[PDB]
Amino acid sequence: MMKAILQLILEKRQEFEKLPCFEFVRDETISPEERLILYPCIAAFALNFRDLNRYDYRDDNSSDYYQKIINIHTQEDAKHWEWFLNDLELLGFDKTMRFSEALRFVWSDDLLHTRRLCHNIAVLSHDLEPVMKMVVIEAMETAGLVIFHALAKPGESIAKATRRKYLYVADSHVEVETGHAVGTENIITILEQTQLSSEQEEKAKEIVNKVFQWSTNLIGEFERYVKAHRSEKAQPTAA
Amino acid sequence: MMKAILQLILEKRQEFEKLPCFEFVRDETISPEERLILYPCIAAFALNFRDLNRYDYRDDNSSDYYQKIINIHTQEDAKHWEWFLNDLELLGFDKTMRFSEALRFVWSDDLLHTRRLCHNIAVLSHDLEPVMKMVVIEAMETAGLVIFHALAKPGESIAKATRRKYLYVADSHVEVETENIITILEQTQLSSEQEEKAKEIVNKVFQWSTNLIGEFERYVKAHRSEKAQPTAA
Ligand SMILES: N[C@@H](Cc1c[nH]c2c(Br)cc(Br)cc12)C(=O)O
Ligand SMILES: N[C@@H](Cc1c[nH]c2c(Br)cc(Br)cc12)C(=O)O
Ligand SMILES: [Fe+3]
Ligand SMILES: [Fe+3]
Ligand SMILES: [Fe+3]
């Protein structure tokens, strides 16, 4: 039942939206610089997410049409890592450090789940047919939209106050994620018309469970990082 | 029993040993500082190799005996990333930079195969039985031993000249690499399907290692002046 899979995604989304980290990020009584304290944590993810789209999801030598739809989808998501680096500099988090200090930060044990999220997604997606890969992408995009709907609230506050163009923790990022390329069909529209077998349904349920459990593990690391570095607020500069 | 697989590993090793990068690293007529120009490239691998042993290979919740032998083997290999960071500082490569520059370096397109080698190994090993995981580990350890037999030649030269204790590009690292996995493979009978999969494993591991070494060669050519800068005691 693909109707049950897409509703399972909504059920997982509704539970995921209630995590304490998002209540903190959406709280406008706290300065947006303190709500974006978790921003450096995304460095263990953002470029690994670029590689996930470049090299794991994508298969340019494929003739299958559903794979080509996945390929078109990766072309958009593989651009967002430069947006992350754009806002990293604007937030005053692109700090100078020793090369090994940058390595120890990315591979910190406190960012374990953040760093291996795309890795675990790639392992889960490797032996899947294209329509089952779409379930992974749809669940992953659903969790990501919950995150960036929240992060865009302090990001757009800093962007208007400092008069700087933010690209990652911004509404334009959310709107691009919500939409899709002109001329291509929606992955969700393809899923709504797809009939799954009993074996596919069991694998699809496992996919949704794992994607949101791993996203929840990541968000837990964001919370603990904010608690452990509560003074390391963002330091943007006005234009 | 599995003699063809262990011989295939030996054939791939002998072919792998002849790559031009290793001839460059073993040439003592070139200063060891110039032969270790490729050392920063390992930043895209060494810590990913730590995670590979910690989280992909290792399975502490397993009762299988072959998996426990893998778990013990990962406890040694998961320590070597700190050795890499040690020799990184000694060689004068632990330089100061912006956070994004370090990110752009690791995820450089010129280090693609270096960066995703452990990732591709993990993807290959995930659905394998423990004895088949051992085939992956054995081929990977054989290629790594060819790498560090070579790098230890200029590394020990700098270690002797500067009287500093190197840990990664050093003989002590090679000696640790050299309950055995190899003994289990010799006593294991594979099915026809298992043997065919083991051939695929060996081909992929050494092909991916060859791509990594190819990136090391192009990096040395592109940064021929950025020789190591170690200091004497
Ligand atoms: N829109 C995100 C993609 C994304 C998708 N899912 C995500 C999760 Br779960 C956590 C984080 Br942090 C990021 C994502 C990006 O462009 O990097
Ligand atoms: N002895 C290496 C492990 C290793 C095993 N295989 C390797 C290959 Br192929 C390339 C490189 Br660079 C390193 C390895 C280490 O501890 O980092
Ligand atoms: Fe995005
Ligand atoms: Fe090692
Ligand atoms: Fe080893």
Q: Is residue B75 part of a domain?
A: yes
B45 lines ligand 2 (CB under 6 A): yes
CATH number of domain containing A135? 1.20.910
Look at chain B and report how many structural domains it folds into. Answer: 1
Please state, as a whole number, how many other Cβ atoms lie within 10 Å of the Cβ of residue B209: 25
- For B85-102, the DSSP string reads HHHHHHTT---EEEHHHH
Q: d(Cα A205, Cα A200) in Å, to the nearest integer? A: 9
Q: Is residue B17 part of a domain?
A: yes
Q: Is residue B230 part of a domain?
A: no
Q: Is A150 a known ligand-binding residue?
A: no
Q: How many CA atoms lie within 13 A of B160 on its CB side?
A: 8
Q: Is residue A57 part of a domain?
A: yes
B147 lines ligand 2 (CB under 6 A): yes
Q: What is the DSSP letter of B189?
A: P
Q: How was this structure determined?
A: X-ray
- A97 chain-B contacts, CB cut-off 8 A: 96-99, 102
Closest CA to B8 of B185, B144, B227, B128: B185
Q: d(Cα B98, Cα B40) in Å, to the nearest integer? A: 16
- A50 chain-B contacts, CB cut-off 8 A: 107
Beta carbons of B51 and A85 less than 8 Å apart: no
Q: Is residue A233 part of a domain?
A: no
Q: Which residues line ligand 1 (CB under 6 A)?
A: A 42, 45-46, 49, 77, 80, 140-141, 143-144, 147-148, 177, 215, 218
- Which positions ≥6 away from A148 have C-beta within 8 Å? A168, A169, A173, A174, A177
Resolution in A: 2.3
Q: Which residue has the tokens 């043997």?
A: B195
Phi-psi category of residue A186: left, alpha or beta, with phi > 0 → left and psi -120 to 50 → alpha: beta
Which tokens is A45 given? Answer: 């993810």
Q: d(Cα A73, Cα B54) in Å, to the nearest integer? A: 32
Q: Is residue B229 part of a domain?
A: no
Q: Is residue B99 part of a domain?
A: yes
- Which positions ≥6 away from A232 have C-beta within 8 Å? A37
SS3 B217: helix
Q: Is residue A239 part of a domain?
A: no
Query: Which residues span the domain enclosing B45?
Result: 3-29+41-222
